[PDB]
Amino acid sequence: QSALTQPASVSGSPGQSITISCTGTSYDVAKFDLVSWFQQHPGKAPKYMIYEVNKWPSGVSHRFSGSKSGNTASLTISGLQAEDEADYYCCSFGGSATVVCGGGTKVTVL
Amino acid sequence: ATVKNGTVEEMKNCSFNTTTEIRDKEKKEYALFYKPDIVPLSETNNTSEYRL
Amino acid sequence: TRPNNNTRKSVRIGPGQTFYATGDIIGDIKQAHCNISEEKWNDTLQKVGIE
Amino acid sequence: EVQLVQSGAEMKNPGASVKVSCAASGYGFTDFYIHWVRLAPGHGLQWMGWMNPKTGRTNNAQDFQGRVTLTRDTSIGTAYMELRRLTSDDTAVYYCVTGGWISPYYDSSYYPNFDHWGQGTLITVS
Numbered sequence: 582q583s584a585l586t587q588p589a590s591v592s593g594s595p596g597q598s599i600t601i602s603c604t605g606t607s608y609d610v611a612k613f614d615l616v617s618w619f620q621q622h623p624g625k626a627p628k629y630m631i632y633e634v635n636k637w638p639s640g641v642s643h644r645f646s647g648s649k650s651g652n653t654a655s656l657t658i659s660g661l662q663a664e665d666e667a668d669y670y671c672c673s674f675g676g677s678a679t680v681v682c683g684g685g686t687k688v689t690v691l
Numbered sequence: 692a693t694v695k696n697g698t699v700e701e702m703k704n705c706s707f708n709t710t711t712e713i714r715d716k717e718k719k720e721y722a723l724f725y726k727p728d729i730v731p732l733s734e735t736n737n738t739s740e741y742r743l
Numbered sequence: 744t745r746p747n748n749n750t751r752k753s754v755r756i757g758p759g760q761t762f763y764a765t766g767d768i769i770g771d772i773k774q775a776h777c778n779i780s781e782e783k784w785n786d787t788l789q790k791v792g793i794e
Numbered sequence: 795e796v797q798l799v800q801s802g803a804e805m806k807n808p809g810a811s812v813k814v815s816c817a818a819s820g821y822g823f824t825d826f827y828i829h830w831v832r833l834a835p836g837h838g839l840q841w842m843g844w845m846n847p848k849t850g851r852t853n854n855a856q857d858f859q860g861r862v863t864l865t866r867d868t869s870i871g872t873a874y875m876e877l878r879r880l881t882s883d884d885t886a887v888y889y890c891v892t893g894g895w896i897s898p899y900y901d902s903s904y905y906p907n908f909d910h911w912g913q914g915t916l917i918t919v920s
């Protein structure tokens with residue numbers, strides 16, 4: 582199990598509901614509500630979209646949102662745009678004072 | 692082990708020969724101890740030999 | 744609070760009894776401490792000064 | 795604003811070791827954790843280890859237990875990661891990050907608040 586589990590790729594037209602979920606063990610997302618999501622376009626940074634499960638840092642549009650349910654944390658989606666066509670990675674708290682990342686994603690807005 | 696600048700609150704990592712359950716046999720084992728419970732052993736100068 | 748994520752280490756010492764000790768410290772090393780609200784302490788010491 | 799401008803890309807062949815340096819500006823260096831993450835060419839993303847730039851204490855992914863050792867020079871404002879025992883699987887676009895603020899009273903090291911990043915280097919183990 583390479584790091585956290587994630588879908589390989591997800592998609593959906595504007596107006597459609599989406600969730601790009603990320604799942605870990607009891608030594609993982611369950612405990613501390615420590616999960617975050619990234620926005621990587623090609624040849625750029627993994628732009629910083631969500632952290633502390635639900636919060637969005639400054640510079641983020643408040644369409645983006647997140648959530649936790651026990652062993653998984655779901656990226657919550659609204660109002661798709663051509664900018665949302667992007668990777669959606671996942672990194673969280675891993676035990677023994679580490680983090681553990683996710684397999685990634687590619688969105689294709691339809 | 693040592694750290695400089697700022698501040699450091701470290702404790703010592705001290706090894707000691709232990710008598711295992713076989714009285715003939717001994718093995719090297721270690722434990723971490725806070726400084727107040729650890730005192731240098733020899734009245735002569737030695738930077739590594741300590742006592743409880 | 745003691746923030747350090749200490750570990751339990753056990754050592755057999757003589758026939759059938761175990762000595763315990765700390766193993767590696769997990770995570771980053773930090774300082775133990777205790778907190779008090781400032782204005783409540785000022786109020787306590789002022790009311791004690793009144794007496 | 796804030797940047798953690800890394801070095802340029804440099805590569806050796808499998809079995810050797812390589813280097814990447816991670817600068818910082820303008821914010822102070824000794825005040826936030828420095829994190830190293832790896833994004834392999836046909837994979838998701840990985841984590842190398844966290845650097846405490848003040849005391850030098852570090853922890854690293856158990857995959858890289860002996861293969862990686864992190865260091866820093868606070869006066870310059872730069873941090874170093876050196877990966878040994880290389881393979882082609884150790885190709886990636888390597889990134890360097892400021893993690894969370896450092897308090898003396900609690901452990902914020904493992905918080906994945908990968909706020910600001912380095913500008914990236916293409917280390918194909920060639």
Ligand SMILES: *[C@@H]1O[C@H](CO)[C@@H](O[C@@H]2O[C@H](CO)[C@@H](O[C@@H]3O[C@H](CO[C@H]4O[C@H](CO[C@H]5O[C@H](CO)[C@@H](O)[C@H](O)[C@@H]5O[C@H]5O[C@H](CO)[C@@H](O)[C@H](O)[C@@H]5O)[C@@H](O)[C@H](O)[C@@H]4O)[C@@H](O)[C@H](O[C@H]4O[C@H](CO)[C@@H](O)[C@H](O)[C@@H]4O[C@H]4O[C@H](CO)[C@@H](O)[C@H](O)[C@@H]4O[C@H]4O[C@H](CO)[C@@H](O)[C@H](O)[C@@H]4O)[C@@H]3O)[C@H](O)[C@H]2NC(C)=O)[C@H](O)[C@H]1NC(C)=O
Nearest residue numbers: 638639744778820821822825893894895897898899907909
């Ligand atoms: C017992 O009692 C003790 C205390 O008595 C108690 O300990 C306290 O616990 C608190 C709870 O955790 C803790 O609070 C945190 O404090 C963090 C630090 O905030 C202070 O410091 C910064 C310093 O800023 C630097 O750098 C900036 C540039 O970035 C610069 O502008 C500044 O001038 C300064 O510069 C440095 O470099 C200069 C170079 O020249 C130099 O000149 C300067 O001198 C300096 O060296 C200030 O900016 C702050 O305003 C504060 O003064 C604080 O960051 C932290 O909040 C973050 O984390 C929280 C969770 O821990 C989140 O909930 C929160 O949202 C924050 O998250 C943001 O920040 C993190 C970094 O940690 C980042 O990774 C995130 O992505 C996120 O980013 C978003 O917000 C930031 C703004 O922060 C935006 O900029 C971004 O764009 C994003 O939008 C906590 O608030 C407190 O510090 C601690 N007390 C002490 C003394 O340590 C203890 O817990 C008690 N015991 C018990 C048991 O309870």
Ligand SMILES: *[C@@H]1O[C@H](CO)[C@@H](O[C@@H]2O[C@H](CO)[C@@H](O[C@@H]3O[C@H](CO)[C@@H](O)[C@H](O[C@H]4O[C@H](CO)[C@@H](O)[C@H](O)[C@@H]4O)[C@@H]3O)[C@H](O)[C@H]2NC(C)=O)[C@H](O)[C@H]1NC(C)=O
Nearest residue numbers: 582583584606608609675676677678681748749750769770
């Ligand atoms: C504080 O210290 C404690 C230890 O005193 C520490 O908790 C430990 O965390 C490790 C993880 O780093 C736990 O190890 C697990 O062991 C089980 C075997 O029972 C494995 O199944 C686990 O691995 C699975 O999950 C991984 C993802 O996390 C997968 O990648 C992997 O493929 C496996 O499927 C894992 O190795 C260990 O059990 C705990 N021990 C205790 C006593 O809690 C804790 O993390 C430290 N930090 C904090 C903030 O508490």
Ligand SMILES: *[C@@H]1O[C@H](CO)[C@@H](O[C@@H]2O[C@H](CO)[C@@H](O[C@@H]3O[C@H](CO)[C@@H](O)[C@H](O)[C@@H]3O)[C@H](O)[C@H]2NC(C)=O)[C@H](O)[C@H]1NC(C)=O
Nearest residue numbers: 692703704705706719720721722723765766767768769860
């Ligand atoms: C406290 O001190 C003891 C020793 O005095 C430390 O234990 C030693 O840790 C090292 C590093 O892990 C061990 O050596 C390594 O072993 C592996 C084998 O997998 C090898 O591949 C490495 O090259 C290296 O040699 C060593 O065996 C171990 N010693 C004992 C007796 O267990 C301990 O880590 C110290 N702890 C702290 C917190 O300082």
